[PDB]
Design a protein around this ligand. Structure first.
Ligand SMILES: Nc1ncnc2c1ncn2[C@@H]1O[C@H](COP(=O)(O)OP(=O)(O)NP(=O)(O)O)[C@@H](O)[C@H]1O
Lengths: 366, 374, 52, 220
C-alpha cells in the first residue's frame, strides 16, 4: 500500500532509475506530509506528499484544488532538479508531470486566467533545462517543454511570446536527435504558424514530415494534420483523391476539389462555410481564386482552342460566376497578376484587347 | 505675485505628500477629486517658467488663461507617482475635457499647424494616459478614446506635407496603433462582462485596415463575435484585405471610392505600395521581351490608379524610370529601376461633408461648456 | 482541435503507413467533354464567339 | 500580332500580454507606463527565458525598463543571498536605478535593494551588508573590486549579471581588467545582459565573449 509505494520511491531514488519513478508519480498506475517527510530529501519530501494530495483531490473531484498541489509537485521537482550537478537521471520524471499540468489547467478552467497561471512556471522548467551546458547533458527534454507551451498558447492565442522558443530549438546542435514522438509533434506547430505567416513553402516540408511519420493507432492525430495540410496543400496544387477523403471520413473538401480541379466554388464554399471559420481556414482557403482563375482559363482555352484569345470571352465566363461587379479592368488586372506571378505565360496587348498565351507550353505545370 | 503662491502651495503639496506612506488588492486605485481643467498648481508653475501654450493664453500675454489652459503630458520619470487627488480628475470632467477640444480648438480660427498639432496631440495623450492611470471601466470613456483615435486617423492625412520638425509621421502611427489596441483590451473585457457596442465594427475595420502587411490579422478575423464578424464594416475590411495579398489594385481603388471618409485615409497609408506593385505588374505584363517597349495610355493609368490629375501621375511616372510622352507612357522591362515626398490626395478630402470637429464627434456637437475655476 | 499525445514514445519505420498515390497529379489534362465544361461551352456559344 | 517568346511587421503587443505576474501587472499601469517601443517588444520575450542580449539604442526608449522587468520577473526570493549585480560606473544613474527598483516593486516587500555607489569608504558598505543582506547589489566596478577581494560579499550565487553603459566601461583600459576579474567569481551558469547608448566597430568582438549565443539589436 502506502508503505510499499514509499519503498518503491526508496528503490527508485537509490537505484537512480527515472523511468520507474516517473511511472510511480504518474496517474498511469492505479497507485500525507509527515510520512513523505520523515525519510526523503526535502524537495522529494514535499514532492510525493503533494502527489498524494493531488490523488486525494482527484478522488474528491476538486480540480481547482488539485492544480495547486500539482504546482507544489513541479516546484519541488524543479528544486530537486537543481540539486543534481551535471547529471540527468531525473529527466524522464518531467514527462510524468509537465504533460499532466496542461490538462490539469483545463479542468481548473471548468470548475483563461488559470491556463495562464499554469503557463508561467513551465517557462521556468524550460529555463532550467536550457541553462545547462552530450550523453550526460540535461537538454534532452528541452523540446518536450516547448510542446507543452505550444498546447497552451494556441488555446489563449498569443503568438508574440513564441519567437525565441523557435529560435532556441532551431539554433541548436541536437535539434535533429530528439525523441521521434516529440520531434514530429513540434514540427506541426511551427508548420502551422508558417501557414498563417504567408510563408507556405516552409510549411510544405514540415507538415508533410508531420503527416508521413504520424502513427497508425491514433487516427485523430493523423486527421488534424490532414486538416491543416489541406490549405497549404492544393495552394501548392497537390489536389487530393476521393479515396483519401473517404478513408479519413472527411468529405467536405471533395466538392471543393471538384471546383478547384476545373459560381461553383462560391456555392460550395457558402454551403459549408461554418466549418472553415471554425479552424482558421476560410481566409486561407480563399487564396485559390488565382489558381481557379487559371483553371477557368484552361476551360476557355480548351473550348476555343487558338493562340490569341479575346478578353470579352473571359469577361463572359466570369459573368456566369456572378459575385460582385466584374468589369473589363478587373479581368485584365487579375490576368496581369497571373502573368507576372508565373502561372500564365504570354503578354497582354491593349491595342487589340487580346491575350496571347504560350504556344508550346501553354500554362506551365506546378 | 504668482511666484510666492507657487512656493507656498508647492510646499503644502510636498508636506501633504509626506503625510502618506502597498499590496495587490488592499490599496484601491483612489479616484481623485480635482474639478478644474488644469489642476490649481500647474497654471501658475507654467506661468513663471514661460511654458505657455500658445493658443490658450490671455491675448495680452503675461496672465495664464484661468478659464481654459489645458495640460501637457511630460513623461519625466516623475518621482511623485502623479500627485494625489489633484492632477487626476474624475469621470464627468473627462467628458467635458474632450468636449471643449471638439468644440473650439480643432476648429482653429487663426494660427499655424505645427503648434496646432502639438497642442491637440500632447493633450489627447494626457487624457489617454490619465484614463489609463485612473482604472475606470465604463462605456462612456472608451468612446472618448475612440474620439482621440478618430483625431489621430484624421491627422494621419490632414498634415502629410508638413515639415519633419512638425509631424514626423512614424511616432504618430506608433501612437495610433496603441490607441486601437487600447480599444481591443477595453472591449474584450467589456464584452466578457456582457456590454455591447454601437460602433464596434468601425474601429475593428480600422484595426484590419492598419495591419494589411501583417499576415496574422487573417486569423484574428476568425475569432470575432459573429455579429461583429457579419457586420458591414468588417466585411468592407476583409474585402479590402483581399486586395493586397492577391495584389488586385483595380478592385482596391474601386473600394476607395465606395468607402467612408475615415477609411479612405487609412487606405492612403498604403499609398505608394499599391502603385509600386501595380507598375511592376503592368510593366511585366505588357512587354514581350526585355529589349523593346510597348505603348500604354495615360487615361487608363489615371483611371485605374486613383491619380487625381495628370501632373501627380506624370511626376510619379517619371520618378520611377519611365518616360511620359504626349498621351502615352513607354512601358519598358529593362529600364524599370527602383529609385518621394508624399502629398495630399483630394479624393479623400472631398469625402468630408461635415466640418472637422463633427468628423471627430460622429454626430451633433454639444453646447459650449462654461466653467468658473475658483 | 487539441492535438493529442501519441500512444508510444518510439516506433519503427514499418509501424506507420503511407497511402501511396494520394498526393497525385494527373488532373492537368485536356479532358474537354465533361458536363460542367458543357455549360461553360454553351453560354460561350450563345454570345456568338464560335470556334472548335 | 506577334507570338510570345519564352513587408514591415510593426509591433503589436501591450504589457498585459507579454504574460507577466499580476504583481507586475498592477504596478506597471499605476505609473501610466504604457505604449511600448520596439526595444521592449523585441527584448522582453527572450529576456524572460534566461537568454542573452546585446541591444543598444538612443536615450528615451526604456533600456532600464527592460532590465528591471526581466530580472524582477526571474528573481525568486532567496533567503539572504545576492543574485543580481549591476555595474554602470556613473553616480547619478545608480540612484535612478535604485529608486526605480523601488518604484516597480510597489508590491514586493521581500525584494530589498541596496546601492553601493562610491565615495563612502569600504567599511560603511560592509556595515550596510552585515546589518541587512540585500538580494540585489548595484555599484561602480572599482568599488565592487575592494568589496569583492576582502571576502565580505558572497558572489558564488550570482544568477543575473547586468551591465549598463558598457561603452565607456570598455573603451578605457584598466577597467576591462576589472570586468574580466569580476567575471571570474561568478558561477558558470548565469544570465549576462549588456546595455549601451553607443557602439562601434572596434568593440564588437569582445562584447560577445561574456555570453553564449548572443543576439543583436542595432538601430543603425
Ligand atoms: N514606454 C514608456 N512609456 C513611458 N515612460 C517610459 C517608457 N519607457 C521608458 N520610460 C521612462 O523614461 C525614462 C527615461 O529612460 P531612458 O532615457 O529610455 O533610459 P536610457 O535610454 O537607458 N538613457 P541612455 O542610457 O542615455 O540611453 C525611464 O526612466 C522611464 O521612467
Amino acid at each position: 500500500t502506502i508503505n510499499q509505494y514509499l519503498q518503491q520511491v526508496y528503490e527508485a531514488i537509490d537505484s537512480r532509475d527515472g523511468a520507474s519513478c516517473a511511472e510511480l508519480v504518474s496517474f498511469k498506475h492505479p497507485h500525507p506530509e509527515e510520512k513523505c517527510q520523515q525519510v526523503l530529501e526535502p524537495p522529494y519530501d514535499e514532492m510525493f506528499a503533494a502527489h498524494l494530495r493531488c490523488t486525494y483531490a482527484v478522488g474528491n473531484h476538486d480540480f481547482i484544488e488539485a492544480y495547486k498541489c500539482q504546482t507544489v509537485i513541479v516546484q519541488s521537482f524543479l528544486r530537486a532538479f537543481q540539486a543534481h550537478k551535471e547529471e540527468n537521471w531525473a529527466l524522464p520524471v518531467m514527462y510524468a508531470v509537465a504533460l499532466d499540468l496542461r490538462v490539469f489547467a483545463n479542468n481548473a478552467d471548468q470548475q483563461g486566467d488559470m491556463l495562464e497561471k499554469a503557463a508561467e512556471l513551465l517557462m521556468s522548467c524550460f529555463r532550467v533545462c536550457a541553462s545547462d551546458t552530450i550523453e550526460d547533458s540535461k537538454k534532452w527534454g528541452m523540446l518536450f517543454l516547448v510542446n507543452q507551451l505550444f498546447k497552451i498558447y494556441f488555446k489563449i492565442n498569443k503568438l508574440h511570446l513564441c519567437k525565441p522558443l523557435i529560435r532556441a530549438i532551431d539554433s541548436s546542435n541536437l535539434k535533429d536527435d530528439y525523441s521521434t514522438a516529440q520531434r514530429v509533434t513540434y514540427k506541426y506547430y511551427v508548420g502551422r504558424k508558417a501557414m498563417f505567416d504567408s510563408d507556405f513553402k516552409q510549411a510544405e516540408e514540415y507538415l508533410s514530415f508531420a503527416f508521413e511519420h504520424c502513427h497508425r493507432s491514433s487516427q485523430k492525430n493523423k486527421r488534424m494534420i490532414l486538416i491543416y495540410l489541406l490549405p497549404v496543400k492544393m495552394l501548392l496544387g497537390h489536389m487530393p483523391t476521393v479515396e483519401l477523403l473517404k478513408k479519413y471520413h472527411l468529405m467536405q473538401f471533395a466538392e471543393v476539389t471538384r471546383a478547384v480541379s476545373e459560381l461553383l466554388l462560391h456555392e460550395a464554399l457558402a454551403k459549408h462555410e461554418a466549418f472553415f471559420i471554425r479552424c482558421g481556414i476560410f481566409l486561407i482557403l480563399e487564396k485559390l481564386k488565382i489558381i481557379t482563375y487559371r483553371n477557368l482559363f484552361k476551360k476557355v482555352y480548351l473550348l476555343l482552342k487558338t493562340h490569341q484569345l479575346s478578353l470579352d470571352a473571359f469577361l463572359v465566363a466570369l459573368k456566369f460566376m456572378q459575385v460582385e461587379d466584374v468589369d473589363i479592368d478587373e479581368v485584365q488586372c487579375i490576368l496581369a497578376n497571373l502573368i507576372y506571378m508565373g502561372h500564365v505565360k504570354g503578354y497582354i496587348s491593349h491595342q487589340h484587347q487580346k491575350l496571347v498565351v504560350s504556344k508550346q507550353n501553354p500554362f506551365p505545370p506546378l | 505675485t504668482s511666484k510666492e503662491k507657487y512656493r507656498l502651495l508647492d510646499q503644502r503639496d510636498r508636506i501633504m505628500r509626506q503625510a502618506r506612506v502597498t499590496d495587490l488588492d488592499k490599496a484601491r486605485t483612489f479616484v481623485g477629486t480635482c474639478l478644474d481643467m488644469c489642476p490649481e498648481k500647474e497654471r501658475y508653475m507654467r506661468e513663471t517658467r514661460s511654458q505657455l501654450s500658445v493658443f490658450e493664453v490671455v491675448p495680452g500675454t503675461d496672465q495664464v488663461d484661468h478659464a481654459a489652459a489645458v495640460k501637457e503630458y511630460s513623461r519625466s520619470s516623475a518621482d511623485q507617482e502623479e500627485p494625489l487627488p489633484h492632477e487626476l480628475r474624475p469621470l464627468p470632467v473627462l467628458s467635458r475635457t474632450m468636449d471643449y477640444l471638439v468644440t473650439q480648438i480643432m476648429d482653429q480660427k487663426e494660427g499655424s499647424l505645427r503648434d496646432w498639432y502639438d497642442f491637440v496631440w500632447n493633450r489627447t495623450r494626457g487624457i489617454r494616459k490619465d484614463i489609463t492611470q485612473q482604472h475606470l471601466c465604463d462605456p462612456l470613456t472608451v468612446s472618448l478614446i475612440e474620439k482621440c483615435t478618430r483625431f489621430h486617423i484624421h491627422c494621419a492625412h490632414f498634415m502629410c506635407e508638413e515639415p519633419m520638425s512638425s509631424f514626423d509621421a512614424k511616432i504618430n502611427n506608433e501612437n495610433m496603433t496603441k490607441c486601437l489596441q487600447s480599444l481591443k483590451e477595453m472591449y474584450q473585457d467589456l464584452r466578457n462582462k456582457g456590454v455591447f457596442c454601437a460602433s464596434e465594427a468601425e474601429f475593428q475595420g480600422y484595426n484590419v485596415l492598419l495591419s494589411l502587411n501583417k499576415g496574422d490579422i487573417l486569423r484574428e478575423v476568425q475569432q470575432f463575435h459573429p455579429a461583429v464578424r457579419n457586420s458591414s464594416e468588417v466585411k468592407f475590411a476583409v474585402q479590402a484585405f483581399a486586395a493586397l495579398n492577391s495584389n488586385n489594385f483595380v478592385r482596391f481603388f474601386k473600394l476607395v471610392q465606395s468607402a467612408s471618409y475615415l477609411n479612405a485615409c487609412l487606405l492612403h497609408c498604403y499609398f505608394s505600395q499599391i502603385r509600386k506593385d501595380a507598375l511592376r505588374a503592368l510593366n511585366f505584363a505588357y512587354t514581350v521581351s526585355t529589349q523593346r517597349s510597348t505603348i500604354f495610355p495615360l487615361d487608363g493609368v489615371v483611371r485605374m490608379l486613383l491619380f487625381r490629375d495628370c501632373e501627380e501621375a506624370t511626376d510619379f511616372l517619371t520618378c520611377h524610370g519611365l518616360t511620359v510622352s504626349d498621351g502615352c507612357v513607354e512601358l519598358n522591362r529593362s529600364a524599370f529601376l527602383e529609385p518621394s515626398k508624399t502629398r495630399k490626395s483630394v479624393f479623400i478630402t472631398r469625402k468630408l461633408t461635415v466640418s472637422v470637429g463633427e468628423i471627430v464627434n460622429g454626430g451633433p456637437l454639444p453646447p459650449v461648456p462654461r466653467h468658473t475655476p475658483v | 482541435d487539441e492535438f493529442e499525445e501519441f500512444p508510444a514514445e518510439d516506433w519503427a519505420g514499418l509501424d506507420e503507413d503511407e497511402d501511396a498515390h494520394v498526393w497525385e497529379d494527373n488532373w492537368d489534362d485536356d479532358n474537354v467533354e465533361d458536363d460542367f465544361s458543357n455549360q461553360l461551352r454553351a453560354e460561350l456559344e450563345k454570345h456568338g464567339y464560335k470556334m472548335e | 500580332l506577334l507570338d510570345y517568346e519564352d513587408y514591415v511587421s510593426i509591433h503589436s503587443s501591450g504589457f498585459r500580454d507579454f504574460l507577466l505576474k499580476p504583481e507586475l501587472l498592477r504596478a506597471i499601469v499605476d505609473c501610466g507606463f504604457e505604449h511600448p517601443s520596439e526595444v521592449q517588444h523585441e527584448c522582453i520575450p527572450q529576456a524572460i527565458l534566461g537568454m542573452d542580449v546585446l541591444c543598444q539604442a538612443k536615450s528615451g526608449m526604456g533600456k532600464t525598463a527592460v532590465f528591471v522587468l526581466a530580472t524582477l520577473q526571474q528573481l525568486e526570493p532567496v533567503t539572504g543571498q545576492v543574485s543580481v549585480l549591476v555595474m554602470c560606473h556613473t553616480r547619478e544613474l545608480a540612484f535612478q536605478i535604485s529608486k526605480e527598483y523601488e518604484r516597480f516593486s510597489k508590491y514586493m516587500p521581500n525584494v530589498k535593494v541596496a546601492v553601493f555607489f562610491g565615495g563612502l569608504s569600504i567599511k560603511k558598505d560592509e556595515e550596510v551588508l552585515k546589518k541587512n543582506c540585500p538580494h540585489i547589489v548595484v555599484g561602480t566596478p572599482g568599488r565592487i573590486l575592494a568589496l569583492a577581494r576582502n571576502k565580505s560579499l558572497n558572489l558564488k550565487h550570482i544568477k543575473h549579471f547586468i551591465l549598463d553603459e558598457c561603452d565607456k566601461m570598455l573603451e578605457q583600459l584598466d577597467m576591462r581588467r576589472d570586468v574580466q576579474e569580476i567575471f571570474r567569481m561568478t558561477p558558470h551558469e548565469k544570465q549576462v545582459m549588456m546595455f549601451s547608448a553607443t557602439l562601434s566597430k572596434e568593440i564588437r568582438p569582445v562584447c560577445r565573449k561574456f555570453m553564449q549565443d548572443p543576439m543583436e539589436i542595432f538601430v543603425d
